[PDB]
Amino acid sequence: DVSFRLSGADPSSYGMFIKDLRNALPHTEKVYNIPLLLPSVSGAGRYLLMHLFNYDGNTITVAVDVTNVYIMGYLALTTSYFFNEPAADLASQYVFRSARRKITLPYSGNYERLQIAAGKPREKIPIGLPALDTAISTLLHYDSTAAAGALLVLIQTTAEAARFKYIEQQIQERAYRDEVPSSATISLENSWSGLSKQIQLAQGNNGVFRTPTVLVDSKGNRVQITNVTSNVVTSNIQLLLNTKNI
């Protein structure tokens, strides 16, 4: 398991949590020095449990698929909650079984569905450590509309930060003040599967992407990523989604 406590949290303790999260994800292989997530894991071992504590010390446990870093559901006291999707239903077979009741959320866990349920795109939802505190608090008691927004914050401050060093740094900057994600942040989130694929295809193509990936940079300018010498690849991306799962 991994844990993160918002009480006393700072850029350093948040960095440690993201480190812990990354290190909890198994890999047999590194590709261009980036850990390659596994094609599959059988049984309960597929799911990492993240214990998150709000400023007041109240807690939720979040179930994360270790092959793709996908949040499946969470436990809040004696109630489990799962996305309305086959992968999450499968997860419910293995995690939080001892909950007194299981609620299926009235949406799947993808960004498009969550944004619809929340009534807001990510571009308009501030993120940061304070936002994460709010999200944990929201998830403690069932409210499907509020939960969609909370989940958008949760996903970006945990899984997306784990995937990209840039996103981790962005959350660190938002340790005491929330701010909407940068256009670069949104770009990276949207491109993880694409980037993972191209980095893997580059292995037998002399480090050249079979198809270039279009990204937005920190200055807000639209770059094109064509090979593994790119800063995205050498410094930013921290985990690779296995091409078997693309």
Partner: peptide, 6 residues
């Protein structure tokens, strides 16, 4: 690799 805000 880049950084701040947005």
């Amino acid at each position: 690799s880049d950084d701040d805000m947005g």
